[PDB]
Antibody, heavy 213, light 218 residues
Framework: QVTLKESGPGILQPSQTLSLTCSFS??????????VSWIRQPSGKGLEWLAH???????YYNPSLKSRLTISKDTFSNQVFLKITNVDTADTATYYC???????????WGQGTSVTVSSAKTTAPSVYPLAPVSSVTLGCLVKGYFPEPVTLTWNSGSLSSGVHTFPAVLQSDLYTLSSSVTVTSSTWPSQSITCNVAHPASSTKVDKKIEPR | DVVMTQTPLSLPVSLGDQASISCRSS???????????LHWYLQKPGQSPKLLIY???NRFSGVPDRFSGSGSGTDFTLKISRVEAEDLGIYFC?????????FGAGTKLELKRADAAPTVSIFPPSSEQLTSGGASVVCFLNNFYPKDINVKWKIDGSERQNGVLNSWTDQDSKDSTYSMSSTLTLTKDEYERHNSYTCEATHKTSTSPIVKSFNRNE
């Protein structure tokens, strides 16, 4: 079967060089007509094509980024590479490689690799309980962390129904997310409800019990 | 660059219905070799795009006959017949006749359900955040439909736009609703200078907004 897997550095600082690798199987870049493209997708934004390479080493680039890009391949190792110089915050995106033969461009895509370009330092989140002012809605505010991700559970994962964990948003180089949980009034505060937040990058795990105000 | 104008951006549908998605290019996609390199893809959350149709109207391997592509030159349409739950996601067009290759903005094919008013809850700053010297006010607007909603923050009755962070969930797989989180971040000194904090939600389910408020001292 055709499979493609992208790999990268995860996090880079502005001005550094991004080096991406596409490791594939089920096809060969020695095959006449075969090619591979790189495409990126910043979270919630439009796709942006970057570069393409064919089996005969014909290479194409996005004109607006051409001076910063270099695409190349190691045919026998079944790998394609992309180098992006002098990165900045706008280069933060998921990067995909896609099998792209002459008749069917982008016919199989990898699952992508996340790249974050930031000068931020590893920062553990501040975890705040959100107690209220039939059913009761409680919350957990996970503020000011870097980098992504965090894992958030309620009651060590035993409380999963009626939960809404929201996507993180950036504010002054740091991420913030929130989670709500709705339970019946006969459940809380008579029974303990705690939000559990782990941030593996800062090796932190915080439990915040929701207490009535 | 060749601009790909994709409409509509959001497409609510019922299962079994037909959905039609339009892609218009700023110039002809007919290549000098006579081919038209216009493709259609489906992308699901946390997944990569999958090719559905290549060169306007050719179905890719494994793609059901319910997906059909048509058009020519600068005007293209993807039609999905007898929509099933597995079809829900973001559809986009792409062109590779011209360099750079470009893409439409995407159409989110979503499931239509009955209107549901949001359940709105407001939360003052936690004692822990205030001790730390900060003050965030959170508002959850949960389980509403349609997805279109507007949140307005008011401090002492006056609208506040700066320092607002908003996040939205994807349509729920079980009840087909949407949820939203809105956080107003202030300095603790600002929080300690005003009394009334209000989250106002405008949604199609009510002519008047849903208002949730609290007073810092009450």
């Amino acid at each position: 079967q055709v499979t493609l897997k992208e790999s990268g550095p995860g996090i880079l600082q502005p001005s550094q060089t991004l080096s991406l690798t596409c490791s594939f199987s089920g096809f060969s870049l020695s095959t006449s007509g075969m090619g591979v493209s790189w495409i990126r997708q910043p979270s919630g934004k439009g796709l942006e094509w970057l570069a393409h390479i064919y089996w005969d080493n014909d290479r194409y680039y996005n004109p607006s980024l051409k001076s910063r890009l270099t695409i190349s391949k190691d045919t026998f190792s079944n790998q394609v590479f992309l180098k992006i110089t002098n990165v900045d915050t706008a280069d933060t995106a998921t990067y995909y490689c896609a099998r792209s033969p002459m008749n069917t461009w982008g016919d199989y895509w990898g699952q992508g690799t996340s790249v974050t370009v930031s000068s931020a330092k590893t920062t553990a989140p501040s975890v705040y309980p959100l107690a209220p002012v039939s059913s009761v809605t409680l919350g957990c505010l996970v503020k000011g962390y870097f980098p992504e991700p965090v894992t958030l559970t309620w009651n060590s994962g035993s409380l999963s129904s009626g939960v809404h964990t929201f996507p993180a948003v950036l504010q002054s180089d740091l991420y913030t997310l929130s989670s709500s949980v709705t339970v019946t009034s006969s459940t809380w505060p008579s029974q303990s409800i705690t939000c559990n937040v782990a941030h593996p990058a800062s090796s932190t795990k915080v439990d915040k019990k929701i207490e009535p105000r | 660059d060749v601009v790909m104008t994709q409409t509509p951006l959001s497409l609510p549908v019922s299962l079994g219905d037909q959905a039609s998605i339009s892609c218009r290019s700023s110039q002809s996609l007919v290549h000098s070799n006579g081919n038209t390199y216009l493709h259609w893809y489906l992308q699901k959350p946390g997944q990569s795009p999958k090719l559905l149709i290549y060169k306007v109207s050719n179905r890719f391997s494994g793609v059901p006959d319910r997906f059909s592509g048509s058009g020519s030159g600068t005007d293209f349409t993807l039609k999905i017949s007898r929509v099933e739950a597995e079809d829900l996601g973001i559809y986009f067009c792409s062109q590779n006749t011209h360099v750079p290759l470009t893409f439409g903005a995407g159409t989110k094919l979503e499931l239509k359900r009955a209107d549901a008013a949001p359940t709105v809850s407001i939360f003052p700053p936690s004692s822990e955040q205030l001790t730390s010297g900060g003050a965030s006010v959170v508002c959850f607007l949960n389980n509403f439909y349609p997805k279109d909603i507007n949140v307005k923050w008011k401090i002492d009755g006056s609208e506040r736009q700066n320092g607002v962070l908003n996040s939205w969930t994807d349509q729920d797989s079980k009840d087909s609703t949407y949820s939203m989180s809105s956080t107003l971040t202030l300095t603790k000194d600002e929080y300690e200078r005003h009394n009334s904090y209000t989250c106002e939600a405008t949604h199609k389910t009510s002519t008047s907004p849903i208002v949730k408020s609290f007073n810092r001292n009450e």
